[PDB]
Structure 1
Amino acid sequence: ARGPKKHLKRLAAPHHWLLDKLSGCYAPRPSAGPHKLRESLPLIVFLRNRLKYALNGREVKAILMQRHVKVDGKVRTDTTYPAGFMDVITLDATNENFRLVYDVKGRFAVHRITDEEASYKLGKVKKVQLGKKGVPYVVTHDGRTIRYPDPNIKVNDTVKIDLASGKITDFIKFDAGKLVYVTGGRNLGRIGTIVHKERHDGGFDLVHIKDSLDNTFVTRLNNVFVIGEQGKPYISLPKGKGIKLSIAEERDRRRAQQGL
């Protein structure tokens, strides 16, 4: 249709942003970046709609232009910046450090971390290819292009990044029995160690997963992100740790703690 779309009609905007059906008309269209449109999160929805640090999007823009926010180490002035998974939100004033990881509902959750944890990133390798001048390279889910990796790193493995520097430090391979975070589908936001990989050549490898409640589910290799060992992630999970309570269970819990 004659060229690049510049607007986003608030109604087509991804639901996991939790934007109200009315009041307004448009949404922030995530800038070009390290993350796909429908799995990012603009700074404005985070600062304003997720953190209540703002009301007018204009005020968000000001706040931001004041260099307060910084993502993964760089200041960032983009109002509708495509911040997404594993990214490190950093407020030097207020002394707050955030990491963007999924709920169990499927949304991005407000998660407060250490100042120490906020100095290294996790990154699922999406591809690893030989480069020009014979220099091999790995590229992870967030478009991070790191050269000279370990000759034992394949696709779908996961990786620990410096943030303050570029070098990959530690890495975990995609084996059976690995604490895995589901990043897509409606089984997303859950966590559960991996069971077994349905192969299928040239047509979507299915991944069999099991959480710490002996609940099982499948997905596809795409939505699967490796994050560690049994009971031993490499990042700070949030309240619930991807176990998915049924409607009746949730009903029971939220009306269990009820004594005013």
Structure 2
Amino acid sequence: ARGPKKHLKRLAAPHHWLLDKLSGCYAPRPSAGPHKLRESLPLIVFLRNRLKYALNGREVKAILMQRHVKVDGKVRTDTTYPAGFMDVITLDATNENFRLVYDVKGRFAVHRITDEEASYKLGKVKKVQLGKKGVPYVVTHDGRTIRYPDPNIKVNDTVKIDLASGKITDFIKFDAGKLVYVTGGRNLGRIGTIVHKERHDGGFDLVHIKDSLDNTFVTRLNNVFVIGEQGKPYISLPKGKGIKLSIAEERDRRRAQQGL
């Protein structure tokens, strides 16, 4: 196409943002950044779509150009910064913090969390590798490289980075029966223990996942994101605890809650 595309037609846009069909021709289109543009969430979406603090688009740069918002600690002013999974986003001028942790449909929950926790976040290691000058380094999913890590951490292990200082502080291995988040695929939004990793030499290992309500299911190796010991999360989980309820069951929970 002769080079980099810069627009985004308002339908090719990631569905989980829940933009509306009309309103205009276009969607925000993520900037280049820490997360893959289809797996991301523009700040502009968050502030005006998810948070409803803004109306215009102008009134978002309004907020952003005020440093009212910081992502993973740092002040980010880009209208369309590719904020994504495990991220924090902190609105100081209204003392609230969030965490971009998935819904159970597959969307980005407005899962508000404390000022504790906000000082850390998880990070699946994508590659761990020996850099130049004999130095080693891990590469988390969010586009962080942390040099000098524990020789114990291999790929698909998660890592508790700080947030103000880099630095890995504790880490979880990937093995039989750990608390797992699903980051994409059909089962996006789910949460549970493992049981089996089906190895397929050549490509695409598969992870059978059990939830607290005993519902086995499968995904691909990269879809899986370890987050703690069984029943013991390493972070706050949104409402519904990533369980996936059938639309039958779903019907009740709503109409039965209604009335009183």
Structure 1 position 258, deviation (Å): 1.6
- What is the CA-CA distance between 1:225 and the residue it aligns to? 0.3
C-alpha offsets along residues 219-260 of structure 1, whole Å, 9 cap, x if unaligned?
010100000011111110011111100010000110111215
Share of identical aligned residues, percent? Answer: 100
Partner residue, 1:47? 47
What do the CA deviations read for 1:138-177 (whole angstroms, capped 9, x no partner)? 0000010000000000000000011100110110000101
Question: C-alpha separation between the residues in 2 aligned to 1:120 and 1:37?
Answer: 23
- The Cα of 1:121 is off from its aligned counterpart by 1.2
Distance 2:213 2:108 in 1: 23
- The equivalences for 1:109-124 within 5 A come to 109-124=109-124
2: CA distance between counterparts of 1:121 and 1:212?
A: 23
Q: Matched residues in 1 for 2:36 and 2:230: separation?
A: 30
SS of 1:53's partner is coil
The alpha-carbon deviation at position 203 of structure 1 amounts to 1.2
Match of 1:96 in 2: 96
Alpha-carbon distance between aligned partners in 1 of 2:99 and 2:208, rounded to the nearest angstrom: 27
SS in 2 for 1:70: strand
Provide runs of 4+ in structure 1 moved above 3 Å: none
Aligned-partner Cα distance in 1 for 2:34–2:202: 26
The answer to whether structure 1 residue 137 and structure 2 residue 137 are counterparts is yes
Q: Distance in 2 between matches of 1:157 and 1:57?
A: 39
1:77 Cα deviation (Å)?
0.6
Match of 1:174, SS state, is coil
Q: Deviations over 1:67-94 (max 9, x none)?
A: 0000001101100000000011101111
CA distance in 2, matches of 1:202, 1:101: 31
Summarize the alignment of residues 150-169 of structure 1 with structure 2, pairs less than 5 Å apart: 150-169=150-169
Deviation at 1:62, TM superposition (A): 0.9
In the alignment, the residues of structure 2 paired with residue 258 and residue 23 of structure 1 have an alpha-carbon distance, to the nearest angstrom, of 32
- Map 1:1-260 → 2, pairs under 5 A: 1-260=1-260
Normalised to the residue count of structure 1, the TM-score between the two structures is 0.99
CA-CA distance at 1:179 after TM superposition: 0.2
RMSD of aligned C-alpha atoms?
A: 0.6
Task: Give unmatched runs, 5+ long, in structure 2.
Answer: none
